[PDB]
Amino acid sequence: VLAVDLLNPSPASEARKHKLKTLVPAPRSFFMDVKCPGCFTITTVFSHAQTVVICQGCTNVLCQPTGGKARLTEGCSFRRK
């Protein structure tokens, strides 16, 4: 307070700032890869999906939508990129 480096905020204070209020704004959502153990299929799901994402066939599920992050279903794997 009184003087601070405004071009170099700390990553920890930057990380607790709201989305639109970081120095250059940017998202905080991510993409996941999801397989369901009987299938060798790799569907890529967005973290905050509004669609009941289905794998390439097999009338299953992969996630359900919410007010925030998509709740991935049951036993499923996820790497995140």
Partner RNA sequence: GCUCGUAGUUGAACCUGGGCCUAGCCCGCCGGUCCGCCUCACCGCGUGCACUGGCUGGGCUGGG
Partner RNA sequence: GAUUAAUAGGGACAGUCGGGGGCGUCAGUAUUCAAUUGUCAGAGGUGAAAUUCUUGGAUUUAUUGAAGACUAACAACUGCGAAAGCAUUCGCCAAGGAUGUUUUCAUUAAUCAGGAACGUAAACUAUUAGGGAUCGGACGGCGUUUAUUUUUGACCCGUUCGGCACCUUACGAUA
Yes or no: say if 44 and 31 are a contact pair by the CB < 8 Å rule.
Answer: yes
Q: Pull the structure tokens for residue 9.
A: 């905020």
Which x/- pattern over 26-65 shows residues binding another protein (rule: CB under 8 A)? xxx--x-----------xx-x--xxx-x------------
Residue 79 contact partner, candidates another protein, RNA, Zn ion, none, CB within 5 to 8 A by sort of partner: none
39 binds, among Zn ion, RNA, another protein, none (CB under 5 to 8 A by kind): Zn ion
Q: What angle is formed at CA 15 by the lines to CA 25 and CA 7, rounded to 5 degrees?
A: 60
The answer to whether the beta carbons of residues 48 and 60 sit under 8 Å apart is no
Binding stretches for RNA (CB under 7 A): 15-21, 24-25, 27-32, 44-51, 64-71
